[PDB]
Amino acid sequence: SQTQGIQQLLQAEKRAAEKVADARKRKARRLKQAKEEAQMEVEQYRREREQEFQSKQ
Amino acid sequence: FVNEVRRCEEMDRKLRFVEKEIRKANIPIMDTGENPEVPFPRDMIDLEANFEKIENELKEINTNQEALKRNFLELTELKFILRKT
Amino acid sequence: IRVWFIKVRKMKAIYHTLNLCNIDVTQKCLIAEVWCPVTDLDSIQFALRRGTEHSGSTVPSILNRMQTNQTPPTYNKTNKFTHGFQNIVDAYGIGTYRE
Amino acid sequence: ALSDADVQKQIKHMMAFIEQEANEKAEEIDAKAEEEFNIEKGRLVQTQRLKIMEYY
Amino acid sequence: NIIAAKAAEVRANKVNWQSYLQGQMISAEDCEFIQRFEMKRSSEDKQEMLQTEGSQCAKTFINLMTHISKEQTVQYILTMVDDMLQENHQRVSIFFDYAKRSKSTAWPYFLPMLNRQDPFTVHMAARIIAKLAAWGKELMEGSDLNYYFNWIKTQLSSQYVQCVAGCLQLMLRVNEYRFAWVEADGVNCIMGVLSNKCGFQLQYQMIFSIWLLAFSPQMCEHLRRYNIIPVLSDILQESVKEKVTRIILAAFRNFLEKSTERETRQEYALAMIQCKVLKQLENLEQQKYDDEDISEDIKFLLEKLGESVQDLSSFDEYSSELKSGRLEWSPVHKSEKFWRENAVRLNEKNYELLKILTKLLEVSDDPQVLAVAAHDVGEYVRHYPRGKRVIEQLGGKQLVMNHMHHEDQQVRYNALLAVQKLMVHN
């Protein structure tokens, strides 16, 4: 009866706050993770390019 | 919702002005009727926008024609000057 | 001119009735409580359905019975030969409910 | 009653609303996160690429 | 919602799978699988489901539902099995129903389905399809779906339409394959569903799909060759559903934030030309909404359209069009600033542009350009009476007097306005 009139609001508010906070912390971790994975691929390129330096020599 | 309130107000004022204009035009109304013909679109807003533009150029031509008769008074003065020798 | 006259009249009237509502905190459905004759509520239901067809948005537009202690207003169904006497009797005031 | 069934079908209607707009905003927020990830990764990988170019 | 009611009535009854516990007709070994971890709510069961690795999930159930020809029970069995796929927050994550031994089970098994849109085959196939956009797998052959009738059948015509439309909304997530399918003729199919009249929800999800496409600047350049934005403004005008407006506002924001080249991205002015949406934005300004994103977006729209009008506020483009005879309803023609200040620029050497307009009066009979020229001359004389004297030397007053009798009545009134401007001190 009158009880749905606040349950509507509470469910919507939870569904909004949870995903907003999720995105904030996700970006916070993801910036760092992007740096480290980029560096990992970078050093892999270093290794294989040392290999074709040797082949070229 | 006072935004809807005072836009209702300004359409009212514009309609009052054109009503005064028509009273000066002494053109009677006919009252065709068909009382239920009020629809529910947002097109009413730009329709009355077109109408307020319309009587804006009515005001423009009003000032133009009164200034034009102002000039024409000196024009008649000039032709009277031409008449005398 | 006259059609737009009556149009704008109806517009300000309905906007005034919209002011006469309860804006929920954010619920997109307005909530109101209106006296309705017990002999026309089905006509009101038909009007609500008409609102549904004339604005197709799968909107229910529900009207529900509820009871209160507040005093209802009094109404009289007059006609051509009964309206003048109703004006005469009501010029002196209005009595309690079901008088 | 008739009004009782109206109340119950209202309950399912507002649950349907809740899930609709809630899923909507969820995808909105997730998408925004995706583009911010894309731009940040682009910046950092660009700096790494530059340093690679000078070394090579 | 067909799918919602179908799932609800599915949840009201459980199949007697135990009768075929070791029957190859129905789940000789998968019955023991579904017996295990019946408490699917428990996260311990979630993280121990990977112990199977998919040797039964999506490896024994696969090519076994087709074996069960009895539709009445296999529908319930498959949907109960893939209810896990239905919720699937991260319980799949990186394809926990792995079955790495053969990749035929994982990606390309969708081909036999996409048929029988009534025993839930097509909806289940769509759900299986929708497991790579935001998941740890990728379909090698994008043409095996992009030219398939699982979306060409729903392009016409009906809850299934918006159900598969939502699945397609889930599809458009990453530019790599979005661009690939945009290079196909499916763009024209999107245009076709734009043109036909259908439900408001279908249009809504379609504008959301346009939002999904908006993320790629090069795709925006590709689609710039169409008149989609006029259609966007039209649908904004005709309907107001308080989220379609949000999506359209965000779409314009993303269009004009991804402006790789403003010189070719003329939408900033073309949207204005094909529809004066700024009045709609002003109207939306008056209403306060609980979403601050809307206020930020409308502010961004207002300011960027402001410097759009500033970009269109120039004198050299007007002169270039004057030489070419193109006399439209340009913003400079309605620009009060232009007439107030840059009218001195129109005092050229020999007034060649004004002379060209004078020639256009007697050669061009087009009502529109004549109205533009008449108003321009009227403003020019309004801001430079000696120019009016030069016009009277050229005899242009009698020329406009000839033009008052043109077959286009509004052109007669425009020439009348120009004449009225000519009558100061005259």
Architecture overview:
Chain D: It comes from Mus musculus (Mouse). Chain D: Belongs to the V-ATPase E subunit family. Chain D: This is V-type proton ATPase subunit E 1. The structure is cut from a larger assembly and holds one copy of chain A (57 residues), two copies of chain B, one copy of chain D (56 residues) and one copy of chain E (426 residues). Chain A has one helix at residues 4-56. Chain A is mainly alpha-helical. Helices cover 76% and strands 0% of the residues of chain B. The termini of chain B are far apart. Chain D is an all-alpha fold. Classes of the chains: A mainly alpha (57), B mainly alpha (85), D mainly alpha (56), E mainly alpha (426). Chains in contact: A-C, A-D, B-C, B-E, C-D, C-E, D-E. Chain C binds chain E through residues 26, 28, 56-57, and chain E through 200, 241-242, 290.
Give the fraction of residues assigned to helices of chain A. Answer: over 70%
Derived from helix and strand composition plus strand pairing, the structural class of chain A reads: mainly alpha
Q: What oligomeric arrangement do these chains adopt?
A: part of a larger assembly
Order of helices and strands of chain A: H
Indicate the structural class of chain E.
mainly alpha
Q: Number of helix segments of chain E?
A: 25
What share of the residues of chain E does DSSP label as strand, in percent?
Answer: under 5%
Radius of gyration of chain E: 32 Å
Shape of chain A: rod-shaped
Proportion of residues in β-strands of chain A:
under 5%
Helix content of chain E: 55-70%
Please report the distance between the alpha carbons of the first and last residues of chain E.
74 Å
Work out the largest interface and the residue count of each chain: A-D, 22 and 23 residues
Q: Quick one: how many beta strands of chain A?
A: 0
Shape of chain E: elongated
Main beta sheet of chain A: none
Can you summarize the main beta sheet of chain E? none
Radius of gyration of chain A: 24 Å
Order of H and E elements of chain E: HHHHHHHHHHHHHHHHHHHHHHHHH
Query: How many E-type strands of chain E?
Result: 0
